[PDB]
Amino acid sequence: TDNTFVSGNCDVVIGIVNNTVYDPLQPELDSFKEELDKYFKNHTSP
């Protein structure tokens, strides 16, 4: 999402192709989710 910018939708651009666009913020929150998960896991134990 840093290399690219977004405009419109797929119907208008002649020759557009399908490929994933990496959102680097996603895993930076995913490991945050897993950090949150393990905090909850441990908090159940005592």
Partner: protein, 48 residues
């Protein structure tokens, strides 16, 4: 013919060096960037 043929098939690359092919809509998109209009303004209006 050579100058015109290189322009449509290779843009300005054939002047700077070896003629590198590039789709003309892709080439025109680089030209729009050259004039300070974002390239999506070409693709979203290519027919026009």
């Amino acid at each position: 013919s050579a100058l015109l043929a290189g322009t449509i098939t290779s843009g300005w690359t054939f002047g700077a060096g070896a003629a590198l092919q590039i789709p003309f809509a892709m080439q025109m998109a680089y030209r729009f960037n050259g004039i300070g209009v974002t390239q999506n303004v070409l693709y979203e209006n290519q027919k026009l």
